[PDB]
XYZ file of N, CA and C in Angstrom:
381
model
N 123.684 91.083 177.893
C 123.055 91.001 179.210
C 121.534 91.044 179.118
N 121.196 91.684 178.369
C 119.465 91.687 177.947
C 118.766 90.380 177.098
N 119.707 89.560 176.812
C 119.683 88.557 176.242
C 118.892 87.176 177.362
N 117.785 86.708 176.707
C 116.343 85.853 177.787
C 115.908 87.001 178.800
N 115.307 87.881 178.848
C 115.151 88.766 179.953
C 113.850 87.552 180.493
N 112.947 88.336 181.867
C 112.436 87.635 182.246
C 111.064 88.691 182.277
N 111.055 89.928 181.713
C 109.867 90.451 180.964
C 110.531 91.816 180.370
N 110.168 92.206 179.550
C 110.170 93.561 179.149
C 109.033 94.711 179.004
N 109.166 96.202 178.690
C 107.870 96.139 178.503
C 107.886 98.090 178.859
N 106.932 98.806 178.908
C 106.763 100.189 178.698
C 106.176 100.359 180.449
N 106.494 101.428 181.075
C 106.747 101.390 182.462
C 106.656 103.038 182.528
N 105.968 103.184 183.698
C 106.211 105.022 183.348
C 106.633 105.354 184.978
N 107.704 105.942 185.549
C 108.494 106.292 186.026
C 108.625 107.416 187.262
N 108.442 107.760 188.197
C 108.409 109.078 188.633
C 109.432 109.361 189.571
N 110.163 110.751 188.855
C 111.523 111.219 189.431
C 111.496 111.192 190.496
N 113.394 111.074 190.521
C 113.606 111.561 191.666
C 113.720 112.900 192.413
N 115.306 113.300 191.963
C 115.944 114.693 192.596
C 114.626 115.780 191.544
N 114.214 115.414 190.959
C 113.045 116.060 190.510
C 111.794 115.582 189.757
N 110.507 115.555 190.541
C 109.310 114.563 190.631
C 108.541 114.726 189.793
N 109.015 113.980 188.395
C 108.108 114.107 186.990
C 107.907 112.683 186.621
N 106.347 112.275 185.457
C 106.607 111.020 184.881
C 107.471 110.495 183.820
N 108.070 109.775 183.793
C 109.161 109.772 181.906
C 108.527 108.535 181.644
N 107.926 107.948 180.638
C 107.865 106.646 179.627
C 108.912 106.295 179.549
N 109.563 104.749 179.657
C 111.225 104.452 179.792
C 110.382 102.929 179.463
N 111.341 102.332 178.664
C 111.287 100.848 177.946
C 112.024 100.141 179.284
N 111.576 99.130 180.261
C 112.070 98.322 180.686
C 112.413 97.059 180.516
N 112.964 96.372 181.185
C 113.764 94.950 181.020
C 114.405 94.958 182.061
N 113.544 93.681 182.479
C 114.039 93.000 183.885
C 114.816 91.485 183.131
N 115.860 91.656 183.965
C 117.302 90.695 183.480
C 118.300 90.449 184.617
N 119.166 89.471 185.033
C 119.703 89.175 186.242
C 119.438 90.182 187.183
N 117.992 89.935 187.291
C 117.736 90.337 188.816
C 117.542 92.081 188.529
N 117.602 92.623 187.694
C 118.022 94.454 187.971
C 117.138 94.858 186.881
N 116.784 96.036 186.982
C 115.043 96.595 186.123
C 116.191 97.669 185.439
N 116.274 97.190 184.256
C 116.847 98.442 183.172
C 116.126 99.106 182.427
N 116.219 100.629 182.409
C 115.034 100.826 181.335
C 116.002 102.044 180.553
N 115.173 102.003 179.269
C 115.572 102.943 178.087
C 114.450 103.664 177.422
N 115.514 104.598 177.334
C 114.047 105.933 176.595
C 113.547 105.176 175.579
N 113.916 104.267 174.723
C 113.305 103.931 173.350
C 113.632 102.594 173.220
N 112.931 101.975 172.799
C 112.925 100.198 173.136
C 113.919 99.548 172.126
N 114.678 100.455 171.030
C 115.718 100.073 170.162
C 117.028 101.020 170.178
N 116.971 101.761 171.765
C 118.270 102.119 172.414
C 119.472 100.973 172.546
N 120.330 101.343 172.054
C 121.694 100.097 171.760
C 122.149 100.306 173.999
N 122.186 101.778 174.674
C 122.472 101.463 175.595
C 120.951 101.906 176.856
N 121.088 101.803 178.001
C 120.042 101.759 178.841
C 120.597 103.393 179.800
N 119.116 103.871 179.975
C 119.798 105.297 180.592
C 119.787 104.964 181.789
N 119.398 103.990 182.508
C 119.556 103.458 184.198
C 119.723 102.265 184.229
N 120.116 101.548 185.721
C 119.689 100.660 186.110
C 119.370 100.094 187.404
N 118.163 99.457 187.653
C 118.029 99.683 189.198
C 117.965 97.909 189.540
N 119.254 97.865 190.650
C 119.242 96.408 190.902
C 118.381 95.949 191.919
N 117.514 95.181 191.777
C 116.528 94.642 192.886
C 117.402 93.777 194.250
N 118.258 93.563 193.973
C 118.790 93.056 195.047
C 118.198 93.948 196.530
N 117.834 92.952 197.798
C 117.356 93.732 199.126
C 116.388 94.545 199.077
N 115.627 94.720 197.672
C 114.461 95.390 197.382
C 113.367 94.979 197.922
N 111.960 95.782 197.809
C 110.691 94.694 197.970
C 109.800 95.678 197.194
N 108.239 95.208 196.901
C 107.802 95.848 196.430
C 106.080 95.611 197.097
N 105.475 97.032 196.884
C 104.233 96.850 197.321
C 103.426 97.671 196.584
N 102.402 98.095 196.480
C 100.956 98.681 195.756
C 101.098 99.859 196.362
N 100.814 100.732 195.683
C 100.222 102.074 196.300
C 99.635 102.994 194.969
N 98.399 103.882 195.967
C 97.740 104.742 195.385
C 97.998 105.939 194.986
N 98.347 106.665 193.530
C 98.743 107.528 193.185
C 97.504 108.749 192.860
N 97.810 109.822 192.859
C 96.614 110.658 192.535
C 96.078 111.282 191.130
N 96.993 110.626 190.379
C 97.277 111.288 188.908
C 97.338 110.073 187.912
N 98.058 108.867 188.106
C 98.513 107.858 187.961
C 97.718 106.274 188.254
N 97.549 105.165 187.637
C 96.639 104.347 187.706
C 98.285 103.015 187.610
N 97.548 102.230 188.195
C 98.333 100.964 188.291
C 99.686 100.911 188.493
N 99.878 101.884 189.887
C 101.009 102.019 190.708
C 101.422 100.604 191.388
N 103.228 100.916 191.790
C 103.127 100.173 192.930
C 105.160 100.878 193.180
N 105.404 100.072 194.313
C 106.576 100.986 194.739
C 108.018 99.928 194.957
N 109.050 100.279 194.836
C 110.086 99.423 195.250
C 110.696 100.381 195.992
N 111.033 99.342 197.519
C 111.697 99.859 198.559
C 112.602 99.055 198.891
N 113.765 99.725 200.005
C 114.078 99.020 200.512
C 114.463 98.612 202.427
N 113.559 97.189 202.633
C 113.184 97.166 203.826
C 114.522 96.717 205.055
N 115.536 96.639 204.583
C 116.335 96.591 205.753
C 116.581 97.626 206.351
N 116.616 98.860 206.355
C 117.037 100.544 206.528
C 115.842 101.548 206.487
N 115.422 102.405 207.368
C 114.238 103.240 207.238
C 115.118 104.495 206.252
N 114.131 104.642 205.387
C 114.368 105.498 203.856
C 115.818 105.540 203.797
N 116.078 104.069 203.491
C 117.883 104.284 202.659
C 117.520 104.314 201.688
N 118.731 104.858 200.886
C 118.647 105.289 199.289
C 119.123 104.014 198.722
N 118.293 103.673 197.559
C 118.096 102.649 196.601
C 119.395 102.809 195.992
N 120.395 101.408 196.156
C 121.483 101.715 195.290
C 120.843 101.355 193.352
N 121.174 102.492 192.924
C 121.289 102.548 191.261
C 122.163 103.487 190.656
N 121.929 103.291 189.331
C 122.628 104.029 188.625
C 122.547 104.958 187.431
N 122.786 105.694 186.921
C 122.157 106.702 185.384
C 123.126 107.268 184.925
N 122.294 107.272 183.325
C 123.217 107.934 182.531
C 122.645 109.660 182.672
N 123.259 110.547 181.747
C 123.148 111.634 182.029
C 123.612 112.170 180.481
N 122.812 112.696 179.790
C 123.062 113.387 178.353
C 124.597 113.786 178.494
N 125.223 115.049 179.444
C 126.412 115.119 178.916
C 127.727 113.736 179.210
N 127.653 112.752 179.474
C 127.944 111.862 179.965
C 128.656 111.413 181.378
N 127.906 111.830 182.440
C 128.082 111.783 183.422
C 127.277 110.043 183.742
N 128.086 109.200 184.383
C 127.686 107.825 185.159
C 126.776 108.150 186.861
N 126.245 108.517 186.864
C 125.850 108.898 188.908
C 124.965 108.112 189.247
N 125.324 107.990 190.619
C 124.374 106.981 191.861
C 122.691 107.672 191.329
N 121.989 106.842 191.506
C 120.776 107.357 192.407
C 120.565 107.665 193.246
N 119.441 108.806 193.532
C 119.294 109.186 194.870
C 117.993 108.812 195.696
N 117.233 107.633 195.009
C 115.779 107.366 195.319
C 116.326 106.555 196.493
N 114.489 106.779 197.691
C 114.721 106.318 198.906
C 113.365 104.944 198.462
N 113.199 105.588 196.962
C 111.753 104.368 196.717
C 111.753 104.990 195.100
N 110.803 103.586 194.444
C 110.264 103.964 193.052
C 109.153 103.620 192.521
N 108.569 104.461 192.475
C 107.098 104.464 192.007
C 107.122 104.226 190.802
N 106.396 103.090 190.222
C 106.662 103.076 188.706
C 104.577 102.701 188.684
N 104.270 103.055 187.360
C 102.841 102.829 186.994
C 103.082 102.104 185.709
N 102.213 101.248 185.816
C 101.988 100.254 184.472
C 100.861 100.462 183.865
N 100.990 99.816 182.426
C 100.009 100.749 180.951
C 98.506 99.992 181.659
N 98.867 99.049 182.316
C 97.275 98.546 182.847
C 97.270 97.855 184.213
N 96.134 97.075 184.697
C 95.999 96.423 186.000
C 96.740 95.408 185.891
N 96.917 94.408 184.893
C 96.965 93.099 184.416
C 98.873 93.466 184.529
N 99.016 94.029 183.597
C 100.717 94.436 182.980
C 101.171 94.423 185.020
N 100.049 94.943 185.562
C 100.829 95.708 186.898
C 101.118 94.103 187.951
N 100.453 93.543 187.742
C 99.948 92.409 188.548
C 101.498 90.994 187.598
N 101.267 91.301 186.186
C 102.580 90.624 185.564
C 103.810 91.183 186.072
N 104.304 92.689 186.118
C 105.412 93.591 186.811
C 105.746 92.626 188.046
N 104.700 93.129 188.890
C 104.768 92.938 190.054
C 104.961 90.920 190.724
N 104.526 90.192 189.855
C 104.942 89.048 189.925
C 106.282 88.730 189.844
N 106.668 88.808 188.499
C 108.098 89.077 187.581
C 109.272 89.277 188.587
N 109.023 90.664 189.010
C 110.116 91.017 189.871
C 110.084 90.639 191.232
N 109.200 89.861 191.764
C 109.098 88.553 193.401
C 109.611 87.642 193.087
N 109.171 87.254 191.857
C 110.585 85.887 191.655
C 111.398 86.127 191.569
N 111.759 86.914 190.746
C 113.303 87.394 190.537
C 113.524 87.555 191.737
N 113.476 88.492 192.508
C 114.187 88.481 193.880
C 114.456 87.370 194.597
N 113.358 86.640 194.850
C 113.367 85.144 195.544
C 114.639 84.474 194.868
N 114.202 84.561 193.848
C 115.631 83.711 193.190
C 117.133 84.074 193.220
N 117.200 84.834 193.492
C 118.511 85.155 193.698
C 119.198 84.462 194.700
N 120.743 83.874 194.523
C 120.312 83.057 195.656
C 121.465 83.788 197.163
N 121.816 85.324 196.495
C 122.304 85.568 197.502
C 121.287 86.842 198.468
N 120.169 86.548 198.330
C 119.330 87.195 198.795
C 119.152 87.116 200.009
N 119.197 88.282 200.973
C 118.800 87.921 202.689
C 120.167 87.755 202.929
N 121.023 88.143 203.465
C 122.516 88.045 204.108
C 123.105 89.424 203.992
């Protein structure tokens, strides 16, 4: 499934059910932002499908070359995703949004392109 992605790349993260940064290897691939603690992880500790997503810029206070994925049909519905969990537990996500920061302006502006097409393209997008 990671096979032609449509970027990959180092992404830094901020929790949910508890609000910390993690470094996580991403890869955006049919449409859904997977990321892994280590960029030669055989499996991915999440995955968050962009489907009905959107994304916009925002200013962090700690953090440089933010921006956020929401989702705009529903005021603060929770982002359907998914995670792994060390003792091996599979669970939903509970994000109502995701703040992710990129290693630069440029990387943020590539992110943030990347994943508008992808969405656009999908072609069951909007219904």
């Amino acid at each position: 499934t990671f096979f032609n992605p449509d970027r990959e790349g180092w992404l830094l993260k901020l929790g949910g059910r508890v609000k910390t940064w993690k470094r996580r290897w991403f890869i955006l691939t049919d449409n859904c932002l997977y990321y892994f603690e280590y960029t030669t992880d055989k499996e991915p500790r999440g995955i968050i499908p962009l489907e009905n997503l959107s994304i916009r810029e925002v200013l962090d206070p700690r953090k440089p070359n933010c921006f956020e994925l929401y989702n705009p049909s529903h005021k603060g519905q929770v982002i359907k995703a998914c995670k792994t969990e060390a003792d091996g537990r599979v669970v939903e996500g509970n994000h109502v949004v995701y703040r992710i920061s990129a290693p630069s302006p440029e990387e943020k502006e590539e992110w943030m392109k990347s994943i508008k097409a992808s969405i656009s393209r999908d072609p069951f997008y909007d219904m």
